[PDB]
Amino acid sequence: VVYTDCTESGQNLCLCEGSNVCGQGNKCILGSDGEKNQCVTGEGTPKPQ
Known part of the structure; x- marks a missing residue:
């Protein structure tokens, strides 16, 4: 199954x-003080459609 490119930090x-x-x-x-994209564990959100 595939997703797509985030549109908001926190997704996973x-x-x-x-x-x-x-x-x-x-x-x-x-965008994390320079990281336009990081993958840090934690309860974020299932990037909905």
Whole structure:
């Protein structure tokens, strides 16, 4: 199953780290003092449609 590119930090099934998907149950972050995209575990949100 595929997702798509995040549209908001915190998500975790989107193309967070690179074109690779992060990890549901985790939390991604777009723009972190320079990191336009990080994949840091944590309760974020299942990037809805």
